[PDB]
Amino acid sequence: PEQFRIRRDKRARLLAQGRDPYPVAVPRTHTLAEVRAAHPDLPIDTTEDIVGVAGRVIFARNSGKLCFATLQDGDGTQLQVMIDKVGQAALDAWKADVDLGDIVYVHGAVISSRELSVLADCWRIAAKSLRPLPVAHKEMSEESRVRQRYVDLIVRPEARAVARLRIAVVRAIRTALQRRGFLEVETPVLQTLAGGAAARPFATHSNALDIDLYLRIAPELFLKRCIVGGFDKVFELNRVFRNEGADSTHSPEFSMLETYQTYGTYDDSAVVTRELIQEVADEAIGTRQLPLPDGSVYDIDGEWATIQMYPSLSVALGEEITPQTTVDRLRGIADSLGFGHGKLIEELWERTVGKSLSAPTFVKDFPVQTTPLTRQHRSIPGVTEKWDLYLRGIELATGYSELSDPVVQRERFADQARAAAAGMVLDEDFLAALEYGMPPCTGTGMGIDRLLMSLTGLSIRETVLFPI
Amino acid sequence: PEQFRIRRDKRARLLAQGRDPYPVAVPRTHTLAEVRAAHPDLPIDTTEDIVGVAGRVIFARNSGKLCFATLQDGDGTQLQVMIDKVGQAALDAWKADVDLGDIVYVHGAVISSRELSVLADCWRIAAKSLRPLPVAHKEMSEESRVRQRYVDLIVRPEARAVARLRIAVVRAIRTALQRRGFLEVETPVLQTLAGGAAARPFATHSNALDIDLYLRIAPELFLKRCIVGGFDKVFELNRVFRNEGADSTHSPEFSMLETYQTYGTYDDSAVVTRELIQEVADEAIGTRQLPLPDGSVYDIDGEWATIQMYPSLSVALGEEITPQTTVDRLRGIADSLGFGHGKLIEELWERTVGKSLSAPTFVKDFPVQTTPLTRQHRSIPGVTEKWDLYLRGIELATGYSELSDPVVQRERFADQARAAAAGMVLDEDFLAALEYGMPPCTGTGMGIDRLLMSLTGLSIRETVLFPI
């Protein structure tokens, strides 16, 4: 706590002496990992490979004529340094000047101790830390790890690995989609009215236009415009904003993938989603027998079951539930266990069938009420061609066979608007685009955080770099 | 105008007959481009390659026993269809049912007319357009093209090419950075206070937290946190939000690239920026002798000149200007042509040297006042290690040797805050991170819209898909 001051004082006296504790440049020749992969099996306690390395001093051990430190590169990789070879003054400076958490450059020969080490010709402070690292045991509380992610990444290896995983996962996704001929597009974040999902928006006032603008809840309506526009295959991986509460599967800002493919249906996009998720596991995790903090293994290999909502619900409840089942009947059943038809079906389905699922599973054929954007089913009356994908109990992803009928689409919105009216403007430009004609296409959505969670067992608070 | 109604009426009667004008599926076997690349040089007026194609009817020409139409796939590619082979009823339906702007599937043999055509076994409406296309000559006004981008992309080839260019450019960028070992990260859009640039923020109220949040003006402060965190090389390509006016180089929402590289300086990031831009041209445009709507050619090949701000200004003004030149002196000069020292230097420099530049040029060594985040110059007093890159007269990109000194950084912000005080909270967490120690690193910024503009001659209103 007081050591904040002595650190500040070492900076000040280093400046005064004409030593630079935040130099513009130091000539680092190699990352530590490069040095390692260069000398994998050096006869220990024995080379003229001179290098210039840098790193954070995370461990010091001083001893009269010779000091040893651990340099940890930013990615975790470790090289020990040993400060006769040059400078008594140098050794004194080392001792008086270098603290833990300081970034340090050293130039010299690579050797192995009686542990891979560089024995120094030169050395220099690259950066002076005016704050010690927490010992970290002292296990940084969950909400101090998130509020100081920079320290977390320094002190806790797993923080490093997770960060790098998300990054790998996201790249895996872009690779996979690009391989299949999808083009990534940028669609507006600031919108005059935010559609493509159910949620309350974030509103912000524009100075330029003296009007409110609304942060997107989803790119769907614009992505659809792109399909009208002649895009065959488009995706957009980026943030959406839902002005609502936070829980273990929900946060107001999060990164979601959306995907749109002309001349396929929800049956086609189901297959791609599977392949996509499996292909991600392979690239980023390396197995489809997923290890969990549980200590368990979750198998996502092979084919995944598809069930239908109404039938699977029927089996769970012991009676035939259809689009014709009244709200009065559903209410009764709901009660006997512990607004509208659609909402009741989904709710009962989750409370019965959904919760019981283990293996990866698509549920498909959804109530029309609760699916305003998705086409009516090709044969079955009363339902829409939508699936949800449940993986390891997490609601991962949806796909639709997309409603391209403007008149029907107009109605779906008129119903929506009239439901939440307090006395009714629709998204006229969207509908305008539909009436220019949108070819048959299937869209998907997927949450990145959900993806990682489902894959790893990590909480939403660990998957993102800087939450709050 | 009235044709809106007859189109709506054809939908309605098609529904009634049990013809589906928005079918879930049609079994398209090939894109038109696939058909083309399959039959590049077919002896005209002469094959048993049956296909299933789809496309928008953009040209109709009817003739008793035989109708011809142009199917244009979404990307522009064209195949003609010819509707004896099946159905008198079929030909009647064609004539009464199909209008221009309708999406249509046809299945049959590929042939060449007396023009590559498919002569139909089957055909079906995939989508019914309840709105005709504008003839487009009738040249869609600039602000009707942007407000209805979906129609633009249908009707105007160049709209198609530009859309696809931006997309190629953005991928080119990610390829280039990834090749060099940069990791792309996601940093928050919603912030408790927005830093990393000069601009007024967008503010939005949170329901979860009953507080205002501020849309990011720039990712820099968080990207820096990542470097502290041990990232060696990180970039973030994504939207930033500056609550300010729109002009020909400025819009409140736009996509920018930021880049951060440990153990290099502004001299190093200058080189990468060049290589990066040149590598983009190569991938996306195919030449570095850039064609312009001007009718001119702009050469971005080869090495680019670096000049210094103070000296180049001095030469332009005919007197020695230094960090020591007073605001009283600068004011005088400014006057004689037609707030603080820094602002005056930059202003004079632009009004004299900047405007005169043609070839690609870095200007470097900037006034300390106007560069709070960038390190002080290694030798030259009074200036910071920042460059700006001017390409074809457009302000494309900046790079810094990054200020990692927390105490200095604290001062820079205290000066800033006190300047715009009306009677002073700083970004304490940012500074906290700096005092954990950030290794020497060089950041860059670059505007995607600027990039495209500089490369192509296109206005900012054409480079983005959906502005306003």
Ligand SMILES: COc1nc(N)nc2c1C(=O)N([C@H]1CCCCC1(F)F)C2
């Ligand atoms: C943290 O992730 C989320 N946060 C909020 N607040 N809302 C959602 C998610 C999430 O993953 N969602 C999924 C649902 C299934 C389709 C894709 C999706 F991303 F939308 C909806």
Ligand SMILES: COc1nc(N)nc2c1C(=O)N([C@H]1CCCCC1(F)F)C2
């Ligand atoms: C349309 O682009 C922009 N709109 C606004 N409103 N502000 C800026 C740009 C843009 O490209 N900028 C550049 C300046 C040079 C460094 C990179 C940058 F992206 F910030 C600053």
Ligand SMILES: N[C@@H](CCCC[NH3+])C(=O)O
């Ligand atoms: N917009 C959906 C995802 C895309 C569904 C298919 N059109 C959501 O917010 O969940």
Ligand SMILES: N[C@@H](CCCC[NH3+])C(=O)O
């Ligand atoms: N944040 C800068 C770009 C990065 C400069 C280097 N740290 C801007 O808004 O222009």
